[PDB]
């Protein structure tokens, strides 16, 4: 029956469906442009020169830089076209572009693989009030652990093999998100040395009365090499990245190093 027809065979529902397919293809192009605001252009794996297999859609592939305005009055561009140095403290196992790298030295201190981090700003994340967000409870007297929970302070810090790394001496809290981000651990060896421990790299074990912070990521010997921070009461985004990357590398490297 003639109701929907546009031609002998063509009809409105079919036309509306192809109009959707045209829209959806255009949307995928838009979405893929947004996906390319970090990391692009692509580079040759060996030389690091800007190269990749590209069609004529290359001309629409990467968007003009959008500018984010930060409440400090600084800005961030995306794409910024900044890229990592071509040289790293590792070498390929075979000369082909697809080959993996082997670390030249200690990968955890050389910051390669899961020990690698981004060169974030040497600035702390800020509260809406402009104060640094992540600070020890020593400096945030209005914060407290909820009365229902175990306070980590004074607990021993223990690795997966049962060696004591130290004791918890402070909590670093995020004033903006209202959460514990790090524990500040005084080391058992070189007593008086303090290191940050990412709180999500821990759990509290309380099956036995002398409850303890267990750390699966790294062994007790690795705590002495945890990256240091420049200030005693604030931490930059770069220092956060450096510390968190170090512990994330433990699952691959801690039985090597």
């Amino acid at each position: 029956m003639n109701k929907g027809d546009i031609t002998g065979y063509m009809d409105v529902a079919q036309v509306v469906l192809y109009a959707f397919w045209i829209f959806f293809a255009g949307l995928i192009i838009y979405l893929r442009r947004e996906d390319r605001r970090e990391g692009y252009p692509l580079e040759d794996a060996i030389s690091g020169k800007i190269n990749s297999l590209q069609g004529l859609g290359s001309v629409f592939s990467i968007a003009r830089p959008k500018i984010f305005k930060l409440k400090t009055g600084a800005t961030y561009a995306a794409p910024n076209f900044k890229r990592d140095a071509v040289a790293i403290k590792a070498t390929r196992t075979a000369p082909t572009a697809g080959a993996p790298f082997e670390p030249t030295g200690n990968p955890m201190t050389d910051a390669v693989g899961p020990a690698a981090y981004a060169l974030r700003d040497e600035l702390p994340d800020l509260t809406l009030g402009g104060q640094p967000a992540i600070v020890p409870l020593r400096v945030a007297p209005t914060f407290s652990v909820a009365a229902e929970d175990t306070d980590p302070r004074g607990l021993p810090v223990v690795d997966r093999k049962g060696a004591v790394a130290g004791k918890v001496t402070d909590l670093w809290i995020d004033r903006a998100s209202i959460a514990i981000r790090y524990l500040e651990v005084e080391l058992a060896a070189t007593p008086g040395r303090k290191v940050l421990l990412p709180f999500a790299a821990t759990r509290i074990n309380a099956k036995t009365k002398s409850k303890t912070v267990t750390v699966q990521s790294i062994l007790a010997r690795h705590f002495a090499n945890v990256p240091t921070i420049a200030k005693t009461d604030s931490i930059t985004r770069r220092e956060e990245d450096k510390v968190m990357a170090y512990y994330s590398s433990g699952y691959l490297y801690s039985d090597r190093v």
Partner: protein
């Protein structure tokens, strides 16, 4: 080619099996041993699907359909032309999906991240395995599996639902639906909030966690926060799948009647059974 930050992460190691032999990249793709076995099962199962299309009556993509054996075969292996093809494709697909999950584990190991993604994908695999293995085994015939075809799997859904009079009345199906709708709602809200904070408008500075929490406190009186929403969004999607699996293990293996008639227990409760 590589992303501007990729090279420093492309280290050796993290493989579950096979050692160094497979530990390399083909363009953007990581290979590994489970990459190879992914390709093995993928090519086999795909070519067997195309073979089934060549055997069948049409090349119209929507109409192509590889069907399970007749229920009269029970759980025996059928002849290739009589449903055995569907059986080989099914176990090749299991091989492919399991290989894909284990390949993701190797990538997680190399990057020092947690295993949440292959774990979550394991619920997709379990849902597929429930429909093509567990349910037909408990019902005693491979012929209860869904056919591999663009429209014919939807026909199987239709036939299977109306076999129980009206599938909307399955209580686990109602809960599965609720969680699927809630997942899409939560995703719409989560995508919107991050974009509204990152893109406040021309002449406005990027907003942070306090604004993010304040928007949903102002609108609906609660904020789950930036970590909680990813926990919730994951749990919602996985629970929707779990209840979908339950609704299908109920229908046929356990409960065989009309789902509308099941609810008559409610009207018979003694405090209102007048």
């Amino acid at each position: 080619a590589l992303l501007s930050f990729e090279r420093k992460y492309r280290v050796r190691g993290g493989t579950l099996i096979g050692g160094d032999l497979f530990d390399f990249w083909v363009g953007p793709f990581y290979v590994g041993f489970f990459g190879v076995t992914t390709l093995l099962f993928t090519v086999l199962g795909t070519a067997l699907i195309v073979w089934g299309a060549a055997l069948g009556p049409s090349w119209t993509f929507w109409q192509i359909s590889i069907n399970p054996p007749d229920v009269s075969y029970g759980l025996a292996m059928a002849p290739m032309a009589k449903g055995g093809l569907w059986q080989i494709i099914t176990f090749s697909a299991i091989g492919a999906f399991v290989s894909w999950a284990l390949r993701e584990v190797e990538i997680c190991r190399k990057l020092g991240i947690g295993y949440h993604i292959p774990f979550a994908f394991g619920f997709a695999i379990l849902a597929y395995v429930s429909l093509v293995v567990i349910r037909p085994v408990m019902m005693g015939a491979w012929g209860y599996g869904f056919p591999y075809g663009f429209m014919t799997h939807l026909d199987w859904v239709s036939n299977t639902g109306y076999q129980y009079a009206n599938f909307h009345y399955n209580p686990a199906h109602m809960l599965g639906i609720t969680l699927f709708f809630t997942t899409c709602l939560a995703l719409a809200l989560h995508g919107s909030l991050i974009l509204s904070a990152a893109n406040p408008g021309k002449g406005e500075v990027v907003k942070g966690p306090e604004h993010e929490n304040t928007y949903f406190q102002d609108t609906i009186g609660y904020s789950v926060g930036t970590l909680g929403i990813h926990r919730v969004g994951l749990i919602l999607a996985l629970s929707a799948v779990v209840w979908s699996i339950i609704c299908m293990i109920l229908s046929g293996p356990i409960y065989t009647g009309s789902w509308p008639d099941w609810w008559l227990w409610w009207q018979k409760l003694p405090f209102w059974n007048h």
